[PDB]
Amino acid sequence: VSEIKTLVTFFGGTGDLAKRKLYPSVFNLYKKGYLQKHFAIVGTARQALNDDEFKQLVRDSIKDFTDDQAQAEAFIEHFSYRAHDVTDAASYAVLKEAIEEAADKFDIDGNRIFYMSVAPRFFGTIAKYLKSEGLLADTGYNRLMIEKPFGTSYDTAAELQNDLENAFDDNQLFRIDHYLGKEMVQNIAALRFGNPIFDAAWNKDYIKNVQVTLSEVLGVEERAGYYDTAGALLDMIQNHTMQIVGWLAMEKPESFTDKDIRAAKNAAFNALKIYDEAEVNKYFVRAQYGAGDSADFKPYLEELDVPADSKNNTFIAGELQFDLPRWEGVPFYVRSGKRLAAKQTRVDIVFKAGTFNFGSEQEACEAVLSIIIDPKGAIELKLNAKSVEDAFNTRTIDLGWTVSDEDKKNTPEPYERMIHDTMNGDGSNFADWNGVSIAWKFVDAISAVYTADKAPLETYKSGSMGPEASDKLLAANGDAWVFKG
């Protein structure tokens, strides 16, 4: 294929994410013939390590991904390490050395990507010294990959944006969101724009409501310390859920270039309504899991590191409103929580019921287009047909499709897609500042209420699909969650 000439620097190169997801993803791009001669990977962290010692760390990361050892050993020759304190300007000179040493050794003309798998407080500092200490390439491109999370509130997000803006341009900033890097999610645009019958129907005159579901069957497990302060609201809703909503709510672009794609998404984001105390209580529902029917499924308050008086949300559900001609009055429902009935990430477009009177007892019901993203990709379409009865009557049938095994292990995991796309300069599957600022303003209004506790905290049994309020929320507009479990 066309060789990808690039140099990647991994900050936090000894961390678990680097070992478990980053290196294997890079290794695959080598296996697929993208990365060949002209490429180098410089790892960096606070721990001391020999170039010999680092290579073994990488050798371990890809052990399970290795078929031909000679192939692995060849890939590993492109790796170098350097111990480094990110808060020390003088220490960056050592890092610049390793980077330029690599650029010479493999003959790479610029094209540098800086990945930051470090704690969120080091983001601004690092970005600053890459520019001032001369690490940015004078030729080719310079791109920065910012890990999750990009702020914890609009204010902190804006600060980060400002710090980063001091060394890079917005189009060089690649904010990570693994959900946006999921193959099935990228099908949304193809299904809509690729088929006129759906394209011309993606509006208020055809849709009754839209549903986004990021259901998890796991509890807090071990990340309770950090989670208790974030909750489902900032952990799944603010980031993953809002960005999926962006692909669904967006206007029709003028082209499929990332520039127009974002213009189309931002048009919708700029129309999203921000709620006040009263609206939050009416449109949103927060809850936390209690014990299920199994003693093994203990309540949230009994999890390790969780404070006994915690009013944190392990589940969130609510209605979104877009003040756009296209979505005038159409409800966008979203939900995400832990200890639910099943692991599932899906989108459900509920079309309006037809008004053609068939004279029958059972008249036409609402059609549904479902796009299952996790655990396994699948596309279903519920349509109205005739019942197998004597007197003419209608019923709903489900047409379905599921990814083949050929499709499955041939599909690129999110981290590979993101790294690959950054190397190609394609920001199509990445969130931009405008999208992130709006999502933060949306979530902040809600959090303020919760923080002040001017809204109730519901409860639900571990194993259900949420509290009953979640159902009542939709019933008010005459709707119901498609996925029941």
Ligand X SMILES: O=P(O)(O)OC[C@H]1O[C@@H](O)[C@H](O)[C@@H](O)[C@@H]1O
Positions 367 through 426 that interact with ligand X (CB under 6 A): 374
Residues with Cβ within 8 Å of residue 142, at least 6 apart in sequence? 110, 112, 114, 136, 168, 172
Beta bridge partners of 332: 210, 320
Q: Which does 477 bind (CB under 5 to 8 A by kind): Ca ion, ligand X, its own copies, none?
A: Ca ion
| Residue-wise burial string across 459-478, b where 16 or more C-beta atoms lie within 10 A, e elsewhere | ebbbbbbbbebbbebbeeee
Count, residues near Ca ion per rule CB under 5 A:
1
What is the rounded CA–CA span in Å between residue 206 and residue 168?
43
Per CB under 8 A, the segment of 151-159, 199-207, 243-251, 322-330 that binds its own copies is 199-207
Query: Could you give the CA distance from residue 124 to residue 172 in angstroms, rounded to a whole number?
Result: 15
The span from the CA of 456 to the CA of 168, in Å, is 43
CA dihedral 264, 267, 270, 271 (to 10 degrees): -120
Which range touches its own copies (CB under 8 A), out of 15-23, 299-307, 380-388, 473-481?
Answer: 380-388
Question: Contact 249/265 with Cβ under 8 angstroms?
Answer: yes
Token match 């290196």: residue?
A: 23
Task: Return the number of the residue (162 or 255) whose C-beta is nearest its own copies.
Answer: 255
**Annotation-wise, does 343 bind a ligand?**
yes
13 is in an annotated binding site: yes
Based on the residue annotation, tell me whether 38 is a catalytic residue of this protein.
Answer: no
Under the criterion CB under 8 A, does residue 385 sit at the interface with its own copies? Answer: yes
CB of 478 or CB of 485, closer to ligand X:
485
394 binds its own copies (CB under 8 A): yes
Work out the angle at residue 60's Cα, subtended by the Cα atoms of residues 77 and 422, and round it to the nearest 5 degrees. 65
Identify what 379 binds: ligand X, its own copies, Ca ion, none; CB under 5 to 8 Å per kind. Answer: its own copies
Q: Rounded to an integer, what distance in angstroms lies between the CA atom of residue 23 and that of residue 27?
A: 6
Query: Minimum CB separation from ligand X for residue 409, in Å?
Result: 17
Sort 111 into a burial class: Cβ within 10 Å, 0-12 / 13-18 / 19+.
buried
Nearer to Ca ion, 330 or 347 (CB): 330
| Under rule CB under 6 A, residue 228 binds ligand X | no
104 is in an annotated binding site: no
CA distance 336 to 316: 6
Name the one range near its own copies by CB under 8 A: 72-80, 232-240, 276-284, 393-401: 393-401
Distance CA 105, CA 245 (A): 45
477 binds Ca ion (CB under 5 A): yes
Which amino acid does the sequence have at 379?
Answer: I
Stretch that binds its own copies, among 107-115, 192-200, 233-241, 437-445 (CB under 8 A): 192-200
Q: What's the rounded Cα separation, in Å, for the pair 213 and 349?
A: 12
Q: Which positions ≥6 away from 474 have C-beta within 8 Å?
A: 209, 333, 480, 481
Residue that has been written with the tokens 């003419």 in this structure: 392
Annotated active-site residue in 78, 84, 240, 420: 240
Q: How many amino acids of this chain bind ligand X (CB under 6 A)?
A: 5
Binding flag, residue 398, its own copies (CB under 8 A)? yes
Task: Answer with the entry of Ca ion, ligand X, its own copies, none that 178 interacts with (C-beta below 5 to 8 A by kind).
Answer: ligand X
> Does residue 178 touch ligand X according to CB under 6 A?
yes
Confirm or reject binding of residue 281 to Ca ion (CB under 5 A): no
For the annotated catalytic residues, the residue numbers are 240
Positions that interact with its own copies (CB under 8 A): 32, 183, 186-187, 189-191, 193-201, 206, 252, 255-257, 351-352, 354, 356-359, 364, 367, 379-381, 383-386, 388, 390, 392, 394, 397-401, 403, 407, 410-412, 420, 428
Positions that interact with ligand X (CB under 6 A): 178, 216, 235, 345, 374
